[PDB]
Amino acid sequence: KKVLTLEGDLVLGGLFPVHQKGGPAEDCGPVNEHRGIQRLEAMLFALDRINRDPHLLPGVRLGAHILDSCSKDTHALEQALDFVRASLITGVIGGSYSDVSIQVANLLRLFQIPQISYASTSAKLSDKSRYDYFARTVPPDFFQAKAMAEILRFFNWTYVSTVASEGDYGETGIEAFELEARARNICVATSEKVGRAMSRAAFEGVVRALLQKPSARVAVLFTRSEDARELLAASQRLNASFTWVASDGWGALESVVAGSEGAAEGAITIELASYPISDFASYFQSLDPWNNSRNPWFREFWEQRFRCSFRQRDCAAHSLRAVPFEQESKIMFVVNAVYAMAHALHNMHRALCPNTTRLCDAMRPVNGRRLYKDFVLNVKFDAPFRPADTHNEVRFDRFGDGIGRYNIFTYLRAGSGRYRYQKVGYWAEGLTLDTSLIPWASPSAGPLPASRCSEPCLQNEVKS
């Protein structure tokens, strides 16, 4: 377990899923080449931008204590314990998965230090009676289930199946989806859950249990990334081809369709409404394993991505600028979270130190309660690295969440040379779909896959 620490006047924590789910041997195995590393580097880039920003903490240089959660609650809680060892840092911009953020908030509220998540959308995190020193730039996931139900009603998918992961993300997501589908005349065929320590055989059995109902031609997903990938692989191995409805776990991630791009074609997924940062790409492409010794996880990711071997010094010519780079739907959220923490610290400084620029005697002990209260209300700023067209700004509501907006993607272009997603609509206090971009939804190509108990029999002869 390696520690990444920066130097600054006041240090803030962070917990990023740099490594993937822990295997049976070690606590965590492979490196998240797209979620953990990219979000970590985006947080580092935004911190470097704030440290060079004269309007946001000009004289106060804020540091970092970013760590790896290893996609597991045990390792995440151990890193949060390493965080709270000082009070046993000021804030924590950390927590991707739901249960990770849950345990981190449980441990941090115990020491009264705030936390601004960037990927955990669980609804139970909005409970301020249980997690009061917690916030997030991503909105909760109970109206995300509303968007999924509205999409299902748009295509008249009544008899649908459900699949999710155990914990705090899949359970609440499935509950919200069922509550919003019972009100939209959409039925649940099979209500199931998947575990954390899984295998290929378990997902094959899950696909077999979902295949015994041929009427459920579509299954909604509230799983994580690895669970969705394993489910897609099991459906591809069992020759099961049916459209999916994915949550933020899959989203627009290309590592889920890695190898199983056939069984994932025409799957309507829902991701968070964001935008690609025009400056984070230039930062990540200019990264090298030798000029970025600040992060050893970056060296490990470089070694595991390009099939490198630092004991062989062979890949001294590779670079990120040569390979194609694609951001995420959460990089905007991690930069918004760190910028909101920085704006909160700046407002607290200008309120408690209205004369000087550096920290004062009343500022060195950072009170987490007053910091969180000054953050939830005295934070309203245009989103950093925002395009000139949109007017998006970071505003935390009464529950410390973000505005409710989602994008709807679909997997198309079965050609092996252009494997990609396609944004077909946006959900913002209402449903908006453009079926002209979906291949199977267009009537010229063919009818849409229906999922109902029985056929819509005509009233002329047969009654209902």
Partner: nanobody, 117 residues
Framework: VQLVQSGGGLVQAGGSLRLSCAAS????????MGWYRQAPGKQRELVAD???????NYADSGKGRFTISRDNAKNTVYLQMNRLKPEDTAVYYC????????????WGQGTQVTVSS
């Protein structure tokens, strides 16, 4: 949902008082909203409640008192102190019932309502 309260007041016996309790909609169907009273370290007692449909109930000693009025537009409940007494020195709270897979009740902050001689 979050429950905000206003109108604490420090009045004597036989005076008038208005306690308002508001909430946030958040596209949630709050089906019941009422008031409660309790002392620090004791049990809570209902004093007034409305199910947003006309059914209104009170406490056993406040049948003719604790006039309440609510509306489904702003989701706000207003209570009036009809007749005061030195026995209601406890702090008051307002609750809101929302049914989203939990059937949970959301409470509010404390409002000090005390009546002296």
């Amino acid at each position: 949902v979050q429950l905000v309260q206003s109108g604490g007041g420090l009045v004597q016996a036989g005076g008038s008082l208005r306690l308002s309790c508001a909430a946030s909609v958040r596209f949630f169907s709050i089906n019941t909203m009422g008031w409660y009273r309790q002392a620090p370290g004791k049990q809570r007692e209902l004093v007034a409640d409305i199910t947003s449909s006309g059914s209104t109930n009170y406490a056993d000693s406040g049948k003719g008192r604790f006039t309440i009025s609510r509306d489904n537009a702003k989701n706000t409940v207003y209570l009036q102190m009809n007749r005061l007494k030195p026995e209601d020195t406890a702090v008051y709270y307002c609750h809101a019932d929302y049914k989203y897979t939990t059937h949970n009740t959301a409470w509010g902050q404390g409002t000090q309502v005390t009546v002296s001689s």
